[PDB]
Design an enzyme around this catalytic site. Sequence first.
Site, PDB file in Angstrom:
ATOM      1  N   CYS A 163       2.926  41.022  26.294  1.00  0.00           N
ATOM      2  CA  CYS A 163       4.227  41.356  25.721  1.00  0.00           C
ATOM      3  C   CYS A 163       5.077  40.096  25.572  1.00  0.00           C
ATOM      4  CB  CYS A 163       4.896  42.438  26.592  1.00  0.00           C
ATOM      5  SG  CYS A 163       6.665  42.821  26.381  1.00  0.00           S
ATOM      6  N   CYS A 215       8.643  40.241  26.847  1.00  0.00           N
ATOM      7  CA  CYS A 215       8.527  40.268  28.306  1.00  0.00           C
ATOM      8  C   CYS A 215       8.407  38.865  28.893  1.00  0.00           C
ATOM      9  CB  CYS A 215       7.309  41.076  28.741  1.00  0.00           C
ATOM     10  SG  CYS A 215       7.340  42.802  28.312  1.00  0.00           S
TER      11      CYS A 215
END
Length: 107
Positions: free
Chosen positions: A31, A34
Amino acid sequence: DKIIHLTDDSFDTDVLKADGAILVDFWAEWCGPCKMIAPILDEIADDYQGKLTVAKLNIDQNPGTAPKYGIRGIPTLLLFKNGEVAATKVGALSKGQLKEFLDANLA
């Protein structure tokens, strides 16, 4: 290291039983957003020392916990207050954006 590295087994004790504010980051290694907030969370862990603890749950290594909080998109930041979610932030944000979010919701 000021950050709590959560598991599905440790969540209850680390988050739901803690006496104060926990910022939980639900994230994954693939991600992009992220990984962008990761160094920000390090700095915030330092800055908010004594006011809150930052904790991270990787949702692939620990698949059980996110669904209990209806997590879909990641990163999702949940601010817990004594086991009770107070605030929700989905997606990436700058240190300035996180500070305001934390300051406004720690009150």
